[PDB]
Paper text:
It consists of a 20S core particle (CP) capped by one or two 19S regulatory particles (RPs) that gate access to the CP proteolytic chamber. The redox-active thioredoxin (TRX)-like protein [name] is expressed in many cell types and was proposed as a nearly stoichiometric component of the human 26S proteasome. It uses its C-terminal PITH (proteasome-interacting TRX) domain for binding, while potentially reducing disulfide bonds with its N-terminal TRX domain but how it binds and is regulated remained unclear.
In PSRpt2, [name] and Rpt6 are ATP bound, while the other four subunits are bound to ADP, meaning that one hydrolysis event and one nucleotide exchange occurred during the transition from PSRpt6. We noted a clear bias of PSRpt2 for being [name]-free. Interestingly, PSRpt2 exhibited a larger gap between the coiled coil of Rpt4/5 and Rpn11’s Ins-1 region, perhaps increasing Ins-1 dynamics and destabilizing [name] tail contacts, similar to the RS. It is tempting to speculate that the Ins-1 conformation in PSRpt2 is less inhibitory for deubiquitination and more readily transitions to the active hairpin state that forms a β-sheet with the C terminus of ubiquitin. PSRpt2 may, therefore, represent a PS that is suited for the removal of ubiquitin chains during substrate translocation or unfolding. Interestingly, this holds true for all PSs and spiral-staircase registers of the ATPase motor, except for PSRpt2, in which a slightly larger distance between Rpn11 and the Rpt4/Rpt5 coiled coil may allow an alternative, more relaxed Ins-1 loop conformation that disfavors [name] tail binding and likely accommodates deubiquitination. In case a substrate contains additional ubiquitin chains, the proteasome would not have to switch back to the RS for their removal, as the PSRpt2 spiral staircase would allow a cotranslocational deubiquitination while [name] is dissociated or transiently shifted to a low-affinity backward position on Rpn11.
Numbering used by the authors:
A (entry chain K): 4 to 241
B (entry chain M): 3 to 244
C (entry chain L): 2 to 241
D (entry chain I): 4 to 251
E (entry chain G): 6 to 245
F (entry chain J): 2 to 240
G (entry chain P): 2 to 205
H (entry chain H): 3 to 234
Write the structure that this text describes.
């Protein structure tokens, strides 16, 4: 009889599981597929748009956003949940650029965001905060003093450094494909080609310019989201 | 069985009893056994501690605390509960010293701690402290007192009492001991043999005995039995337990 | 349902148990194993790192809180992390107000006091994280294991987590050397313990193990694949 | 089911507690008001006058709020009193802040906001009171607004709320000539509506509670019809009904 | 019909507060009994004592206490609720003395503490302290008073009152004695109390099993009748 | 089960209270807004007042600021509350930064308000969807839809309420670049979309047009008959 | 010198079955002159009027909060406020801010609603209630009006005689001070008529 | 209908709050009390009968004064009545302090109604199981009011609630006349107590208070005995 423990996050299963947190985890699969890959030359983030109507403004739907010029993001889950998460992340990065006047590392970015996360069952919510686990899985990538770095965040608050992680509806299959398609010496161009290959194999529709949002972060330049022409260039090869 | 009435501590029974404190009684009786005896010029304490794993160091989960310099702390029940109750009692004694400027009487400390443990018995958002603890002290101008306070909240005065799975058993074999006359030297022996006979060896084996006392023998100061007197008590036990 | 007595920590069973506390206790049995050993002047924490997938890094299980005191987590990431920030804040407050390191026994006592409040009061879920505490103070090394029942034990060793009974019985076989061992000897003993936890098909690789060592003059330092390399070079082969 | 606290949403989207607060007004006394060319009035039913009520009151269903604001109440007595007191507080707070009598629409919206806040959040039962505010303002002359326990409102020139409200309002809209009734014809229409909607062959003036609002000589006067006046009006309508039936 | 006996703040059909009656029945759960008798210028309180073993300290197990230097108290029920309620009563009496500069009359003390218990039973944040109270004292221009308070916050003065397991029979015996309209001198009041207890219990108790307190006009201090005087009184009753 | 709790994830990862509040909009009324080259239009189905309702106070279309407007679908009390809060926030934003509030800012504020109203128990979500329209400082036409889930999105021409799917498909089939060349073409499109669901025409439709900072005047019920004469004329013109 | 920061002059009078209240019309800062339409006398009813003396803005604030609370009371009770309740009410309104005192010394006057017995009252800055059977003044001209109303008033004074006495008293009293003056408004109220006037004194 | 008779913040699908009705049912089971408004004053009485004459009747009083001219009686719970008396005294004295004038009884009834309906606003706090009878004289007029656990308040020429209230109300409506005198009002009140007293009222078995132009005063036992003898 699980039913007595799913009601509420502050319950413990006979197997010691957090059923509310597990449901939040599974709620990630409701979101669109997001794939990020880490290479020596940088990190690239590929996502699916899942456009509901051609009359939609594609700029509104945001699967990848900028927390700071040196770092990038990817989302899978509730739009508003991730909106609060990203706003907090940007506020935190400016907090660091205020306190230490430096660019704060991506591992610390996911540290602070996970600090905002996993706070659902915390008494400090008296002013007002999450009474429910945050329902978005986060993909953080960028370049810091340790070179290019990509971190995947779990709505439970867990983070892990991942060379190539896939979140969203097709996380299992995309991860399985990335398992054999990834090599350590992969160049940025061939990595992005492989990422769009995985998206093509995974996405429910054909790949056009309005089906993919593409992002890149390299030590040289700042965060660049691929424009329409850059997206066409990177998709015409595939 | 009272179903529908024992989900909270603020709900009475058709017979008129809070089943939460009765379940705390049950938990205490399902816990370890601790005896204490008040001598002519002080009080002594004894804990039967089961070594659940030899991997545990000796002195782990120390159970004979000392709330104040002249007040000890023996307790049976939940170790987390024991530590929380000890901490609130220590804060109470420190507040008493800060506000009133002298040592806290054992009866007054027992009254304050019983009131506080009651304050966790009758609410709904909290749970009664499911642990029974001992209060012992020796004052040159007041005397010696002993008190047992269970999660029910009743702080009664016992000459020397026991709590645990051998409550009635320890009552039977502590009744035969004459108490009021001899001092700690002739009482530690009785405590040691009592603790070593109440414990069951076929089931729930692997126990060690730790002891503590307060009195003028250490200048009204609670401390564990000295290692020499400790091994002497163990030797009297092994001789007497034959 | 007769188990209506396990929906909150503030209700007792008819037999006098808090089944929610017991479920929290069993929760840390899910996490990966972690065993600690302590010498005359050195205490080691060795844990088995786990990864979500082989294409991603292994989950860190050894956490540094202060130069002299270190912790190892096994259980929920959220609760363990919160306990870690609480530990760091308290250790700093001790260094600021007393200029002396937080005693291991005192630190574990405040840990018990902090984690008892969720067990006693409605609201916060019980801290379901098994913590292995290894530090150094006046009477030398200490190993403290804080069970998620808001209880702690002074132990010569402990393995907490998945299949930790194998390491427990390994240490039960091998007390007789723990006290008199040096760094390398205790490290290899701990590695054999984890190898006992680990099944046949798997072995303690560089990415698989995490080692944390503290001592009288040596701070709580955690080693990684390249850092565990000299320590595993002295490691023997699995007796299979 | 979804009949728990008001902060719930039925799968079809309905707010069942708010729905019940709606239908609960059908148990309240019947009160109406209509908008005349140069006057506005409130007619209400005194459902409970058994034998021994002292009638130590100026009006029961009709409550005055301000030199320009008056309303009729329909709901639980406790929530009725609370709503009236909050109406007074808000109207006079606006007067103190702005040195002008509060516009009827503004005060109505203030009440509606409070009522919504009492069903929007907080786990508090919504005010089960439906109001009929009557008043004058220089912006729109004479205005009549029909409140709602849900927190909505509407500007109406003819509206009845209480028991047997549906039939009353149906016949009222059947027999309403907008823009061409004075105070006298409006009084006659209200009396006829009461005749048709109450459970009495001959309604007594005691069971009837009428207050009229009229602006004259630069000032707005709110008066409840005195017993002599209300009895004269009811007897006039009674002989008018007699005239109608003898002609028929 | 039923099912409304779960919350203190829930009105059952027919407007019956079940849980309050549940607390009143919990008063009896202590298993003891107590009676109070008042004379022209005296008020005697006597209560039974049950000792499971000699192992307890009889000097601390008293069931009657002293609120202020002239106001004494006796009560029964759950002993923890008993001591909490006497602590609250002493707090209230001290606050009254602080604020108003003169000793609390028995009627006002009962009224205030009954108001406290009413507030307890009116809001669902409190278990309504399931122990009944009997308060005694002397007041100028009115003489001795005996007042009773209950968990419901219902307070009333009594010429004679009772509580415990034998409430109804003790009250019937009290009525049988008071209908004879006799002056009830101090020794006579004490003996009526002892006879009531002995007959309703049918035990003819040894003098060591009863604690007695008395307040008189010549002795406004609440005097706990010591072993010597209770022996004198009740063995005199025996021979008388 | 998992439905009667605002902040409890279902086993399949749904906050069912949020989706029920979202569905509550579908029981409102059709409200379609289109943004043109220099104009933005709001077409809403008007409830035909029976005999006595004062149409002056049945406001379905309201302007938050002189540079933004909005139409709502859902419970009117919630819409009134959010209107008051959002216009108060527009004024406070002008207090803080002195420049006119951009449509993005006010839409983000509305979405955040709805979201903070749907993340804790004891607070029922705002069961209203609002179409935000207006021009920025540089006069760019932007239109936003806010969803009771607390999210917002940029729509070139969207419809909400009952029958919003039919209007959506109609706009998909008829929204062209040349259909917004002139103000009259945008008007023709919006009245066509309206009469798709409210086929009675004439009354039961309200329109509002915002040009490049004209402080929009709602089309008054003299040229709605004129504009529907134009619509019927073009309608018999292509057929 | 806080009184001199704006100044003012008010006086209240009663006669036989009638009341007369008079007030200054000047508004000006402690040194410079600005306007002459300041309202120190305020209608708390058909036959109730209150005169205020103190800081100009403090006067207006206390008048407005008084009107708010008085309309609240009138709506709560439905009856006309009987002037002794008004005097206690104004005393409370001033006193409830003892540690933050409004440096305003007001005055009231009226008649009993039932027996038509005139009543006047005086209030202090921190709110000391006071009632006189003859007269009361407040403002910057307290000494002169006090003295000459002591030397001029007679008991049981007829309504026309009441108007003449108040007019002469207020004019010849305001002739003796400068910060308060340049136009005085006189309000005589009787149970039958309310004749609102403004006596022609010097404009200087 | 059962799932809604458990909280004070949920509306029953058909009617209204059921906990209020249950509080009213608790009220109707209390001690009978009758109040009568005469031309020149008001009278309210109640029965103090209780078993175990050991009880001190003088110890507690069911009729208490709120100020020099306002008195009240109840029917239902005792401690809730005491709490209501305390709150009413505090409110009336606050009004006195603010206005320095004896509190009109209409405002007192309104304020006490507000305070008792406050307990009905939210869950976790039960409504008062007590109904109030308010007697008062002011502006040459005797006022009689009833205050409800629901916070409703209404006027009464003469009413009676508590046990057997329907029979008492029928008796009153078959007895009361608008030109009743104070002494005859007391006679009618004692007769109303009698027709369902069940056990031969004594001087102390009942408790009656009276209010008039000279304020409110609870009748002393001697006058109660005299009136009981006069009625016989």
């Amino acid at each position: 009889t699980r039913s007595e423990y799913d009601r509420g996050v502050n319950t413990f299963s006979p197997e010691g599981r957090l059923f509310q947190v597990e449901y939040a985890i599974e709620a990630i699969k409701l979101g669109s597929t997001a794939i990020g890959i880490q290479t020596s030359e940088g990190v690239c983030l590929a996502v699916e748009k899942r456009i509901t109507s051609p009359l939609m403004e594609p700029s509104s739907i945001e699967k990848i956003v900028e927390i700071d010029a040196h770092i990038g993001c990817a989302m899978s889950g509730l739009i508003k949940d991730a909106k609060t998460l990203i706003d907090k992340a940007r506020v935190e990065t400016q907090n660091h650029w205020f306190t230490y006047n430096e660019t704060m590392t991506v591992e610390s970015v996911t540290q602070a965001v996970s600090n905002l996360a996993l706070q659902f069952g915390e008494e400090d919510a008296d002013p007002g905060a999450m009474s429910r686990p945050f329902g978005v899985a986060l993909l953080f990538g960028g370049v810091d003093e340790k070179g290019p770095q990509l971190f995947h965040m779990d709505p439970s608050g867990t983070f892990v450094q991942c060379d190539a992680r896939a979140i969203g509806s097709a996380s299992e299959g995309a991860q399985s494909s990335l398992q054999e398609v990834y090599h350590k010496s992969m160049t940025l161009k061939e990595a992005i080609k492989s990422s769009l290959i995985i998206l093509k194999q995974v996405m429910e529709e054909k790949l056009n310019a309005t089906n993919i949002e593409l992002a890149t972060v390299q030590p040289g330049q700042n965060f660049h989201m691929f424009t329409k022409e850059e997206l066409e260039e990177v998709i015409k090869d595939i | 069985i009272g179903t529908g009435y024992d989900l909270s501590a603020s709900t009475f029974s058709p017979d008129g009893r809070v089943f939460q404190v009765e379940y705390a009684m049950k938990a205490v009786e399902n816990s370890s056994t601790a005896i204490g005896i008040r001598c002519k010029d002080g009080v002594v304490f004894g804990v039967e501690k089961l070594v659940l794993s030899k991997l545990y160091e000796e002195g782990s989960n120390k159970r004979l605390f000392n709330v104040d310099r002249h007040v000890g702390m023996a307790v049976a029940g939940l170790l987390a509960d024991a530590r929380s109750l000890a901490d609130i009692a220590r804060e109470e004694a420190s507040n008493f010293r800060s506000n009133f400027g002298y040592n806290i009487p054992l009866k007054h400390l027992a009254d304050r701690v019983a009131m506080y443990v009651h304050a966790y018995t009758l609410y709904s958002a909290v749970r009664p402290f499911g642990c029974s603890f001992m209060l012992g002290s020796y004052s040159v101008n007041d005397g010696a007192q002993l008190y047992m306070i269970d999660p029910s909240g009743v702080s009664y005065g016992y000459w020397g009492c026991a709590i645990g799975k051998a409550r009635q058993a320890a009552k039977t074999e502590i009744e035969k001991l004459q108490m009021k006359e001899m001092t700690c030297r002739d009482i530690v022996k009785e405590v040691a043999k009592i603790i070593y006979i109440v414990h069951d060896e076929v089931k729930d084996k692997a126990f060690e005995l730790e002891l503590s006392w307060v009195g003028e023998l250490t200048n009204g100061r609670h401390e564990i039995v000295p290692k020499d007197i400790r091994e002497e008590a163990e030797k009297y036990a092994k001789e007497s337990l034959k | 349902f007769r188990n209506q007595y396990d929906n909150d920590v503030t209700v007792w069973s008819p037999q006098g148990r808090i089944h929610q506390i017991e479920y929290a206790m069993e929760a840390v049995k899910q996490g990966s194993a972690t065993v600690g050993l302590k010498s005359k002047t050195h205490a080691v924490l060795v844990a088995l790192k786990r990864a979500q997938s082989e294409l991603a890094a292994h989950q860190k299980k050894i956490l540094h809180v202060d130069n002299h005191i270190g912790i190892s987590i096994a259980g929920l990431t959220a609760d363990a992390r919160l306990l870690c920030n609480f530990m760091r804040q308290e250790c700093l407050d001790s260094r600021f107000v007393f200029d002396r390191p937080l005693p291991v026994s005192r630190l574990v006592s405040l840990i018990g006091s902090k984690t008892q409040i969720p067990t006693q009061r409605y609201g916060r879920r019980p801290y379901g994280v098994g913590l292995l505490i290894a530090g150094y103070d006046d009477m030398g090394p200490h190993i403290f294991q804080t069970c998620p029942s808001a209880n702690y034990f002074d132990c010569r060793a402990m393995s907490i987590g998945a299949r930790s009974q194998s390491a427990r019985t390994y240490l039960e076989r091998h007390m007789s050397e723990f006290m008199e061992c040096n760094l390398n000897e205790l490290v290899k003993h701990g590695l054999r313990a984890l190898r006992e936890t680990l099944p046949a098909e798997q072995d303690l690789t560089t990415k698989n193990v995490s080692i944390g060592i503290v001592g009288k003059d040596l701070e709580f330092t955690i080693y990684d694949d390249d850092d565990v390399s000299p320590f595993l070079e002295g490691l023997e082969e699995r007796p299979q | 089911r979804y009949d728990s606290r008001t902060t719930i949403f039925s799968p079809e989207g309905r707010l069942y507690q708010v729905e019940y607060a709606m239908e609960a007004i059908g148990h309240a006394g019947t009160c109406l008001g209509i908008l005349a060319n140069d006057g506005v009035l409130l007619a209400a039913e005194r459902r409970n006058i058994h034998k021994l009520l002292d009638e130590v009151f100026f009006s029961e269903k009709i409550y005055k709020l301000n030199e320009d604001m008056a309303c009729s109440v329909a709901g639980i007595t406790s929530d009725a009193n609370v709503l009236t007191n909050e109406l007074r507080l808000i109207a006079q707070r606006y007067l103190l802040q702005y040195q002008e009598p509060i516009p009827c629409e503004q005060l109505v919206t203030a009440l509606c906001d409070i009522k919504q806040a009492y069903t929007q959040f907080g786990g508090k039962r919504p005010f089960g009171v439906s109001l009929l505010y009557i008043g004058w303002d220089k912006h729109y002359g004479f205005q009549l607004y029909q409140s709602d326990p849900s927190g909505n409102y509407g500007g109406w020139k003819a509206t009845c709320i209480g028991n047997n409200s549906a039939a009353a309002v149906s016949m009222l809209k059947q027999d309403y000539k907008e823009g061409e009734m004075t105070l006298k014809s409006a009084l006659a229409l209200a009396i006829k509506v009461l005749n048709k909607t109450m459970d009495v062959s001959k309604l007594s003036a005691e069971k009837v509670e009428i207050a009229t609002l009229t602006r004259e000589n630069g000032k707005t006067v709110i008066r409840v019809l005195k017993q002599k006046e209300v009895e004269q009006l009811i007897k006039k309508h009674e002989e008018e009904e007699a005239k109608a039936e003898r002609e028929k | 019909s039923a099912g409304f006996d779960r919350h203190i703040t829930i009105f059952s059909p027919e407007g019956r507060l079940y849980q309050v009656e549940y607390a009143f029945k919990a008063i009896n759960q202590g298993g003891l009994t107590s009676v109070a008798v008042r004379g022209k210028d005296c008020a005697v309180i006597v209560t039974q004592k049950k000792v499971p073993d000699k192992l307890l300290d009889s000097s601390t197990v008293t069931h009657l206490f002293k609120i202020t230097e002239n106001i004494g108290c006796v009560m029964t029920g759950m002993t923890a609720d008993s001591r909490s309620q006497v602590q609250r009563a002493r707090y209230e009496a001290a606050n009254w003395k602080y604020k108003y500069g003169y000793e609390i009359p028995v009627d006002m003390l009962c009224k205030r503490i009954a108001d406290i218990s009413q507030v307890y039973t009116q809001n669902a944040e409190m278990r309504p302290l399931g122990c009944c109270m009997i308060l005694i004292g002397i007041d100028e221009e009115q003489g001795p008073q005996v007042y009773k308070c209950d968990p419901a916050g219902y307070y009333c003065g009594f010429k004679a009152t009772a509580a415990g397991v034998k409430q109804t029979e003790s009250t019937s015996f009290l009525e049988k004695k008071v209908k004879k309209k006799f002056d009830w001198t101090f020794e006579q009041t004490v003996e009526t109390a002892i006879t009531c207890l002995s007959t309703v219990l049918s035990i003819d108790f040894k003098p060591s099993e009863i604690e007695v307190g008395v307040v008189t006009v010549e002795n406004p201090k609440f005097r706990i009748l010591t072993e010597a005087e209770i022996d004198a009184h009740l063995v005199a009753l025996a021979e008388r | 089960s998992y439905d009667r709790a605002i902040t409890v994830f279902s086993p399949d990862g749904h906050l069912f209270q949020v989706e029920y509040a979202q569905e509550a909009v579908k029981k409102g009324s059709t409200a379609v807004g289109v943004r043109g080259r220099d104009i933005v239009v709001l077409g809403v189905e008007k409830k035909s007042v029976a005999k006595l309702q004062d149409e002056r106070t049945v406001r379905k279309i309201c302007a938050l600021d002189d540079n933004v407007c909005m139409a709502f679908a859902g419970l009117t009390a919630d819409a009134r509350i959010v209107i008051n809060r959002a216009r108060v926030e527009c004024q406070s934003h002008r207090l803080t930064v002195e420049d006119p509030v951009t449509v993005e800012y006010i839409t983000r504020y509305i979405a955040s308000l709805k979201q903070r109203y749907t993340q804790s128990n004891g607070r029922r979500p705002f069961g209203i969807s609002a179409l935000i329209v207006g021009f920025d400082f540089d006069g760019t036409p932007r239109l936003y839809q806010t969803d009771p889930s607390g999210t917002y999105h940029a729509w070139k021409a969207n419809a909400i309420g009952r029958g919003a799917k039919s209007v959506r498909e109609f706009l998909e089939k008829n929204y062209t670049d040349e259909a917004i060349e002139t103000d009259d073409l945008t008007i023709k499109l919006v009245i066509k979309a309206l009469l798709e669901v409210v086929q009675s025409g004439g009354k039961n439709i309200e329109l509002a047009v915002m040009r490049r900072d004209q402080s929009l005047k709602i089309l008054n019920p003299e040229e709605i008959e004129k504009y529907v004469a134009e619509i019927e004329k073009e309608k018999e013109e292509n057929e | 010198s806080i009184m001199s920061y704006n100044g003012g002059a008010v006086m209240a009078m009663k006669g036989k079955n009638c009341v007369a209240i008079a007030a200054d019309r000047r508004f000006g800062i402690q040194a410079q002159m600005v306007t002459t339409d300041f309202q120190k006398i305020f209608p708390m009813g058909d036959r109730l009027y209150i005169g205020l003396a103190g800081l100009a803005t403090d006067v207006q604030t206390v008048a407005q909060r008084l009107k708010f609370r008085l309309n609240l009371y009138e709506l709560k009770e439905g009856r006309q406020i009987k002037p002794y309740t008004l005097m206690s009410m104004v005393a409370n309104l001033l006193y409830e801010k003892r540690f933050g005192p409004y440096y305003t010394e007001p005055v009231i006057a009226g008649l009993d609603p039932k027996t038509f017995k005139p009543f006047i009252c005086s209030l202090d800055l921190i709110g000391c209630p006071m009632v006189t059977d003859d007269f009361v003044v407040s403002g910057t001209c307290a000494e002169q009006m006090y003295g000459m109303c002591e030397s001029l008033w007679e008991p049981n004074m007829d309504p026309d005689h009441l108007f003449e006495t108040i007019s002469q008293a207020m004019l010849n009293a305001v002739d003796r001070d400068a910060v308060s003056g340049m136009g005085v408004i006189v309000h005589i109220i009787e149970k039958d008529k309310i004749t609102t006037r403004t006596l022609k004194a010097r404009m200087d | 209908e059962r799932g809604y008779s458990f909280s004070l913040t949920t509306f029953s699908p058909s009617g209204k709050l059921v906990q209020i009705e249950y509080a009213l049912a608790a009220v109707a089971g209390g001690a009978p009390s009758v109040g009568i408004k005469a031309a020149n004053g008001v009278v309210l009485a109640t029965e103090k009968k209780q078993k175990s004459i050991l009880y001190d009747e003088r110890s507690v009083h069911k009729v208490e004064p709120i100020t020099k001219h306002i008195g009240l009686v109840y029917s239902g719970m005792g401690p809730d009545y005491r709490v209501l008396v305390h709150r009413a005294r505090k409110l009336a004295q606050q009004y006195y302090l603010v206005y320095q004038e004896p509190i009109p009884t209409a405002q007192l009834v309104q304020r006490v109604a507000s305070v008792m309906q406050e307990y009905t606003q939210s869950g976790g706090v039960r409504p008062f199981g007590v109904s109030l009878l308010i007697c008062g004289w002011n502006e040459g007029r005797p006022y009689l009011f009833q205050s409800d656990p629901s916070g409703a308040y209404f006027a009464w020429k003469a009413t009676a609630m508590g046990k057997n209230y329907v029979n008492g109300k029928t008796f009153l409506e078959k007895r009361y006349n608008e030109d009743l005198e104070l002494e005859d009002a007391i006679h009618t009140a004692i007769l109303t107590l009698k027709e369902s007293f069940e056990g031969q009222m004594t001087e102390d078995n009942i408790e009656v208070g009276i209010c008039n132009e000279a304020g409110f005063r609870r009748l002393t036992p001697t006058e109660v005995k005299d009136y009981l003898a006069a009625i016989a």
